[PDB]
Symmetry: C2
């Protein structure tokens, strides 16, 4: 359980970071 | 444990959505 859930957490954080970087890109141009 | 972790999951998803909407905004203008 927790294992996969923690994975689901980790994965989600990785999505977040990506988006944030994207915005920075869009913000810088 | 799992409770708060699930919360940490829920919260994170809510961050994601926000970002996505933001990008859409920036994309539409
Ligand atoms: Cu890894
Ligand atoms: Cu609620």
């Amino acid at each position: 359980e927790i294992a996969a859930l923690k994975x689901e957490n980790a994965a989600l954080k990785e999505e977040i970071a990506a988006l944030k970087k994207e915005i920075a890109a869009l913000x810088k141009g």
